[PDB]
Design a protein around this ligand. Sequence first.
Ligand SMILES: CC(C)(O)c1ncc([S@](N)(=O)=NC(=O)Nc2c3c(cc4c2CCC4)CCC3)s1
Ligand SMILES: Nc1ncnc2c1ncn2[C@@H]1O[C@H](COP(=O)(O)OP(=O)(O)O)[C@@H](O)[C@H]1O
Length: 476
Amino acid sequence: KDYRKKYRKYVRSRFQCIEDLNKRYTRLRLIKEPIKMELLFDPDDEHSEPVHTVVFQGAAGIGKTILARKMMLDWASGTLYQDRFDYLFYIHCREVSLVTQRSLGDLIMSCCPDPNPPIHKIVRKPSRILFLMDGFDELQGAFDEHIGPLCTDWQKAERGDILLSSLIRKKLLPEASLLITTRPVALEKLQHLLDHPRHVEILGFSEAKRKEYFFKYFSDEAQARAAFSLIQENEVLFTMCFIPLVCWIVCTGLKQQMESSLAQTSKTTTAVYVFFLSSLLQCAHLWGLCSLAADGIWNQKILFEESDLRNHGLQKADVSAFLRMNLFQKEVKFYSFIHMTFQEFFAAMYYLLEESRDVTVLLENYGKFEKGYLIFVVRFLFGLVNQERTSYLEKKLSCKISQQIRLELLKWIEVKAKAIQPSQLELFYCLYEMQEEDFVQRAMDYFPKIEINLSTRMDHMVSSFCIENCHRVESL
Ligand SMILES: CC(C)(O)c1ncc([S@](N)(=O)=NC(=O)Nc2c3c(cc4c2CCC4)CCC3)s1
Ligand SMILES: Nc1ncnc2c1ncn2[C@@H]1O[C@H](COP(=O)(O)OP(=O)(O)O)[C@@H](O)[C@H]1O
């Protein structure tokens, strides 16, 4: 009662910003598989028995973290689940070690402000607890389905993977509620652990909310209308801006153009990322940024210490400049890239830099949870390897290595196409990034039949481009 008040006050302060003012928050579209947040845990016709597990699947950059942080803030302010949950515990998955031994009590205490929380009091009513697991796909290391034995004691220290598996399977605090957010790529791994989950999909920004975002980002109404009109004129940007991270990336780059006229002709997500990074260029620490990202991807480190950045040649003034440029993020003496997609962009760039590791071993670990799935590393490799595209940033890349990698990617597509890791639609996202018709046409010939499941206008745009470049050699 008195501790619940002290805890709620702490949650209200630490969840006030997107960075850690939640007035820049724009409503995200959620669908059940127009769901009202307050009714998420209500049974439909489950004879009055509530739903204890809710899974929010959402693409990278769709706003899973922002939605989870808004949920924490709304609840702490008495706006959400006021009469349903005494406690909401935010489990930031990227900070949870899968090997360190810890109890569920230690985990709950790590979410508390003070060193001595009344853990026995908190756990007295498990059904009044909602565990908000943000970013299942961001748990560093392997998350094996065979792990065990399962734990049924909230006080027992277990390896992080056994602890989280026991919690997800509802072995530990069986009637506590659980809200897990994940990229659709990890849904395969997660579904095996889930007990009667309610599945919800985060679709991102509607066309109306895309405009709303641009108008909220730009203080000047004239600048907001000019930036939104640019997006309306460009099919690719208009279509990609359903992803709130893309809205932020585009708005940020257009802001610098406004300082110095508005024109963005980006046709791929690689073009969008290069356009953004080019706006920060006044670059010296490119080999250091790329090696840091590649080391963090291959060795599973999303949070870096001051010691980690020092190992890659990033001094005090450099880490402060990257923080100001919105390339680095300050997290709880820990640093990370502003988004995991940027860490994967610099990891892809590491393989092409001229002064570079083996792309064959990288492709062997593609689609593995242990490595983060390497979706954007591979997509950005297809994009950056495109010779028909250049910039000052891309001039630092080697044409010799890019030509070798281009041949390896074509041989990789051939095997995937000729023979469940990269779907056919995922190969289309890769080919769409490549853009270059000779490669695209050669790769499209490897497919014996087109078998795709389209869900979004982005899926249609990408697959339609690939199918238009899939014409039989003999045809006409
Ligand atoms: C295709 C399928 C089912 O295999 C996947 N669906 C979602 C994913 S993922 N990697 O989890 N998210 C994403 O692709 N996001 C993105 C991102 C950008 C652009 C686009 C998308 C998706 C559309 C264009 C830039 C920043 C993140 S993979
Ligand atoms: N609803 C939203 N309103 C405003 N900005 C948002 C929203 N959702 C996401 N963003 C923007 O997108 C970025 C990435 O969102 P995030 O939730 O971290 O993505 P994900 O968790 O899906 O990987 C945020 O840093 C912010 O700039």
